[PDB]
Symmetry: C2
Subunit: 252 residues, 2 copies
């Protein structure tokens, strides 16, 4: 809670945590979580700790409709998470302590990070995508979003989620905008270094989406972690976080 | 002020006016204004009055960052005006007085209306676009937005506007998202009737953009008003409003 910070976007308060190394000037990563997740998952905290140990600061915010941030979950879209992203980027870019700016996204947060970097290719220095969930578009086009089914041509107002997200309702506007989201076209505009990290045992997002990111990016590396799952659980967390810190290390 | 209504979108209050014919059930048009304009221009009020006289209700809201609505102008994007649009559409679609739903947009409001209808092609019944400002994308790609110039590959935080909008600052995120906005691709998804209205003497938006809307739409009509300007000023206001009311008339 010592690390707690907040910013505003359109009248919504976004709640985050700021982690800094010793010393008053540093590079800064913006770390983005996924669909129904929050800013304090094990993986995101591990990334932040590994970055700090590397003299790289970080902020991680709950997207609107998630965690401690304002907004109903059903009012969240990928587009207004990109807007949340833009507000965080403004906060970081105008911060007097910062040198370079990195984007790190897991799952749907990797889509937000990749599109945001495509819109700010002259400002963001590097990107790390961890199992970025570009499948969310094909999922919405098919009428199946993480097990919840619906007619993709008569999308209801809200769609009840199933499984772990039982009780939660995704907005129809989330699904309608997902169907037409130009994920790779916008993301492609980022020509600076990208590292794409994905588990060979990812059952939630087909690793072909991570492969396609690596194909369209001019300057990228692909890291397939054998046997890792979508969440990078257990021992895989350390592997994914290590690769993330590797890519963003200051090179002293 | 008797007609005054408000709704919320993401913590922002949007202020509008609701105009109803006699009788408790009616079709309902959502009327959208343009860049730096507001909900009460002569043309938009004329459209609303002509619709009312036709037994068609209407709402017209100030977009975020405009008129009496919340938000700084520099925080406005076309994407969060589409989100404003979605919130208005929810308010109309759940209103117990409403039969069918129409979208009417002038200038940038025609872009918001066309993209919103492309995202709700099963809900919106008809669309009227008045000089829709699809040029805003090419303008941002060229680095010239209504006379204000900037490097389109190093877009600053905000760009001061010139001329009538002197004192106002458009956000860099407005310009960055404008550059990649899939205007015609999303709008094309609407296969229901569209009427595209444009003045042959339009100096702000090249009428080739209105022609392209008519080409890509499956079910459209194009009305070129000889000598009319972009605002549909003076005697042209009545002509544009008449054509709008024509297209949306109930056919009794």
């Amino acid at each position: 809670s010592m690390s707690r910070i907040t910013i505003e976007r359109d009248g919504l308060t976004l709640v985050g945590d700021r982690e800094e190394p010793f010393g008053e000037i540093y590079d800064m990563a913006i770390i983005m979580h996924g669909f129904t997740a929050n800013r304090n998952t094990d993986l995101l905290r591990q990334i932040a700790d590994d970055l700090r140990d590397e003299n790289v600061a970080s902020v991680r915010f709950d997207f609107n409709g998630h965690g401690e941030s304002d907004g109903k979950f059903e009012d969240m879209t990928v587009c207004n998470e990109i807007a949340d992203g833009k507000a965080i980027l403004d906060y970081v870019h105008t911060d007097p302590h910062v040198r370079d700016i990195f984007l790190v996204g897991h799952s749907q947060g990797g889509v937000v990070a990749s599109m945001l970097a495509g819109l700010y290719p002259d400002v963001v220095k590097k990107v790390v995508l961890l199992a970025p969930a570009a499948q969310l578009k094909d999922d919405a086009l098919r009428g199946n979003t993480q097990g919840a089914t619906y007619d993709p041509n008569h999308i209801p107002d809200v769609v009840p989620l199933v499984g772990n997200a039982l009780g939660m309702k995704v907005g129809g506007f989330y699904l309608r905008t997902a169907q037409v989201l130009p994920i790779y076209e916008v993301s492609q505009r980022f020509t600076r270094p990208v590292s794409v990290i994905a588990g060979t045992n990812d059952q939630v997002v087909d690793p072909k989406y991570a492969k396609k990111y690596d194909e369209v990016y001019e300057n990228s590396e692909l890291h397939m972690i054998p046997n890792a799952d979508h969440r990078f659980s257990g021992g895989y967390k350390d592997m994914a976080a290590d690769l993330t810190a590797q890519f963003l290390k200051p090179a002293f």
